[PDB]
Write an enzyme that holds these catalytic residues in place. Sequence first.
Site, PDB file in Angstrom:
ATOM      1  N   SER B 199       0.223  -0.986   0.313  1.00 61.79           N
ATOM      2  CA  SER B 199      -0.379  -0.091   0.568  1.00 61.79           C
ATOM      3  C   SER B 199       0.982   1.146  -0.210  1.00 61.79           C
ATOM      4  O   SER B 199       1.935   1.662  -0.858  1.00 61.79           O
ATOM      5  CB  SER B 199      -1.318   0.294   1.388  1.00 61.79           C
ATOM      6  N   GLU B 325      -9.483  -5.016  -4.400  1.00 63.94           N
ATOM      7  CA  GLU B 325      -8.749  -4.063  -3.854  1.00 63.94           C
ATOM      8  C   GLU B 325      -9.753  -3.434  -2.929  1.00 63.94           C
ATOM      9  O   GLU B 325      -9.442  -2.487  -2.191  1.00 63.94           O
ATOM     10  CB  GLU B 325      -6.933  -3.354  -4.588  1.00 63.94           C
ATOM     11  N   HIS B 439      -7.849  -5.798   0.156  1.00 61.84           N
ATOM     12  CA  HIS B 439      -6.256  -5.119   0.164  1.00 61.84           C
ATOM     13  C   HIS B 439      -5.479  -5.929   1.878  1.00 61.84           C
ATOM     14  O   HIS B 439      -6.088  -5.262   2.618  1.00 61.84           O
ATOM     15  CB  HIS B 439      -6.603  -3.749   0.828  1.00 61.84           C
TER      16      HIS B 439
HETATM   17  N   LIG Z   1      -3.334  -2.570   5.563  1.00 63.31           N
END
Ligand SMILES: [N+]
Lengths: 537, 537
Positions: B199, B325, B439
């Site tokens: 990320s 995601e 995610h």
């Molecule tokens: N995360």
Amino acid sequence: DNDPLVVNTDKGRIRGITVDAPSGKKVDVWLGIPYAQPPVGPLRFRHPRPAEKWTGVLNTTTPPNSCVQIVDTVFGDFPGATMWNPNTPLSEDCLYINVVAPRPRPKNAAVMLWIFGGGFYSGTATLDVYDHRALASEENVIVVSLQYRVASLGFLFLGTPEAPGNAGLFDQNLALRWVRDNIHRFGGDPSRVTLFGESAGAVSVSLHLLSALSRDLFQRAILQSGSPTAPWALVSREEATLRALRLAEAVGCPHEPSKLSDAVECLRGKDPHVLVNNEWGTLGICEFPFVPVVDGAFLDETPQRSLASGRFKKTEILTGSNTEEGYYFIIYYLTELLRKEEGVTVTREEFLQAVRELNPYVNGAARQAIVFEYTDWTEPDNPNSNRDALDKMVGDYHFTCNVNEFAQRYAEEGNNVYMYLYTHRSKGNPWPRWTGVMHGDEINYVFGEPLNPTLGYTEDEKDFSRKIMRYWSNFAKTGNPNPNTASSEFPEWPKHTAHGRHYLELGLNTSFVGRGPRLRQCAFWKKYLPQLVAATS
Amino acid sequence: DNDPLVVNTDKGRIRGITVDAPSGKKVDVWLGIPYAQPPVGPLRFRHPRPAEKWTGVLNTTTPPNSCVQIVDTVFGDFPGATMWNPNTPLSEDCLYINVVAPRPRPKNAAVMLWIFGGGFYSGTATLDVYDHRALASEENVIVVSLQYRVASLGFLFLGTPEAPGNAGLFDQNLALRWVRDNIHRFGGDPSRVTLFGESAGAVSVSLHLLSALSRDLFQRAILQSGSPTAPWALVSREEATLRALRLAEAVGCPHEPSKLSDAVECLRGKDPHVLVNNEWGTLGICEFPFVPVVDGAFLDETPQRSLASGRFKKTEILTGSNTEEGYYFIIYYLTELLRKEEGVTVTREEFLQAVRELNPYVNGAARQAIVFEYTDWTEPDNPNSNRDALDKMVGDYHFTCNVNEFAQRYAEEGNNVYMYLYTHRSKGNPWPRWTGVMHGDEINYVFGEPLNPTLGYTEDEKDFSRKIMRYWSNFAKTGNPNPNTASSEFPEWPKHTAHGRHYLELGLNTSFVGRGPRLRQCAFWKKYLPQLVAATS
Ligand SMILES: [N+]
Ligand SMILES: *[C@@H]1O[C@H](CO)[C@@H](O)[C@H](O[C@@H]2O[C@H](CO)[C@@H](O)[C@H](O)[C@H]2NC(C)=O)[C@H]1NC(C)=O
Ligand SMILES: *[C@@H]1O[C@H](CO)[C@@H](O)[C@H](O[C@@H]2O[C@H](CO)[C@@H](O)[C@H](O)[C@H]2NC(C)=O)[C@H]1NC(C)=O
Ligand SMILES: [N+]
């Protein structure tokens, strides 16, 4: 008369002849039964009159004249182009029916009526591909075909009553009324008449499901690669009047919008061949100069409003598209690129230029919407991909998606629909290999042409022909293509239902059932693209 | 000294402890090595200074403080949320490094440096998910993690030298230069350090690939679910300064864009916690208040321009996305729709409203372009389809597509790329079944958490973790995730070429290799929609 081959029709007695099918099986045929007064002289452009009654016995025994039309000479004597060319002499005197009964003759059986298609500008019931004898013999059905006036001679519109439009449709209509009044004498059931056609023939078949006049004249319908909501199916009567006046001018006749009487009179004077040869000018892809129009009599509203309000015959429907509908039309139009030879390809430069020419009415934000929708994004510059992309965008907008819409509207009105996707290339296909399964390849197979021992169809193709002949026939018989005892060599054909949209793939080694077909692209043309052009104008 | 647990770092000496891994194998750990002078008082918002020398030995045995940040509490003490919450005392004094070495100690092993990713507002190196002990022992590689300042405390930008921005990135940078100086003493080769993050951590390692000050500090990069071209990664200078002054205004400080030095001085006075809690105003989905900015030193151009010109480190990269995601951020953002319930669904009407709430900047023609692109045209009204649609349109624009862009751009410039698609949902998942593979689901398997038998991971999942730990490891070692022999237990992972664009699916029963992933949608966001918004204003 105790002679079976003579039949006493409402207008007179007719004599037919016993002939073998190509398969060897013997049938009884009646070729060229006159169903209308020859539309010559004062009667041109106008609706048909019933045939004058005749004294004695008429030998209805010779394949009738085909109506006046252009001949396809752009690829010369190429067997793929000439099979659609008329194979009988051309005449205005062409309104005749053909009846083919099986032997042994049935007392009362199904009637499969074939309305041919040629973009409402060409075609004849007499084509070698429309093999009546093979279908009638192998399925025990009375096969009937008709000749209807075509091109300007069949669809000239000027708003006046001396040219009221839809002559060709009223030709079909009158021919249907003949079948109603006479088909029992040939051993048919006047209540079990199934209309089936391809392309403009399917458009016609669909227009009969809509029409007020030919409503109670048939039972069921099979529609191959065509629907009344297609872009080319109809023109605005505001345009139709212009096309007619532009034709008047082109052939050297008065073309003033005030004196329309001067136009039709002059046009009635000209030779039919020069008349049909000057119709073409500035026309885009898949748009034909003279076609059906909303006249008030046959149709009093557009097929769109008819479908919307649900005003159409409550009956079963068999319909479907081929995989490469577009190619055929993109070969004739847009001729410099995409020529008649193996392994031709399209660049990204050429593809971008084509979408401009193949859709010349969209503002440009819409063209980008098209280039995005019809491009393979795993490999955007691929030469094969950019060619097949052209087939799909033409094939979807003009054919596959319009078929889908019609089938869907019938399904949600509570009617049993049967959707197919024909995916089979004949092993001896004369066209380049990249064309694939083109517009009207299924015609040979539905008419049992592979069963002809003089032709080179493989043993598998012969089974596949008999397979789809059965599907078609017992749909005309029962209202359902599936066998009564549920076979395995005959796969199941699920109903194309409003919520499910199930279709059957028709190919050699398959029983595959999909959904649509091509749902995303149809939603593009029907839902997304219209609201974009509205938003950008 | 002759004790292996003490190491003579350039600024002093530190003592670690030998400890067991969940695998049973033992490793040597050094936890909380101070790499910088604590950024407190007049040093807040500013770039880090190296730490002062210390006399004697320093006990580096306990996990370091976590940087002052907001605490997630919207789901209370829920396992899915709390695993991302800081597990050590929150302190402004947080700039520490962790080093974990295998037994027996290697001489010049590969170094895997982990940059955590809490969207630039949260996170810590100490999270039990990131536990290095498993990866170090199992792959025979020394594992390093750093702490960097987060939120406004590490990313406040005003344009003045008092608040120059990217303090957290300079925190990361100084940690890299520490590793280069000192990692040899732990048994690492300072020339083969590979950065890996997820990320915000992934867009951090991507920015080091771009940065001038960082380019000679590491060898390779692994980028999980992040790229420097992501819309949330950077903010403009105008915005960043306005965001800063709004934080000043909300917290009760002078906020006049004339005298900026008054604002920063006031902000240095206020409580660290009262500062991080008031930065959340009105921000859209996947919009974070304080993030990296193009400052002039660390970055002197936008990553967009830096990618276009090819100004990035020549080296191999391993990158990829998860299948779902979007769901994570929607779950938190659209809190009222699709809440944390089992079997939740979205109506078509709720979907049509959601696209406006999720893309609040597009005009309306672009909204319709989105709804068309993200409709399952098989069943357009399907409650499951319309919910999954939201995940995709968020996950593509904000994550998957940007990862694709970076990987291809690296490949085009002649660099070896390895793309993955992580599709495996862990069995013992705390989230509802509809959320799928969200995610950051890969983290657990990357760090070898299934190898902890007290967590009850399945036997196949235990092997799956060893499989992806290897891929990652021998990529950090060789520059290629494949082993030499290539057995059936370790399938082949083809290179992500410019034209091929191949990815390896990382799931349990799979070994599938695809193209992309999701090419059509990335072409939608990168090519079509940008040119559409331009054509419509
Ligand atoms: N995360
Ligand atoms: C076909 O129709 C013609 C009249 O158009 C008719 O003459 C044919 O019948 C045949 O007529 C011949 C007279 O020229 C005669 O020689 C012949 O015997 C006669 N055939 C029969 C069976 O009476 C019609 N053809 C047929 C087969 O009758
Ligand atoms: C860790 O660092 C602390 C800092 O005070 C140090 O004290 C530890 O050494 C231990 O120090 C103790 C002083 O209270 C002493 O009692 C103990 O003997 C000593 N431990 C030793 C020599 O093993 C440091 N760690 C260790 C284990 O010493
Ligand atoms: N045709």
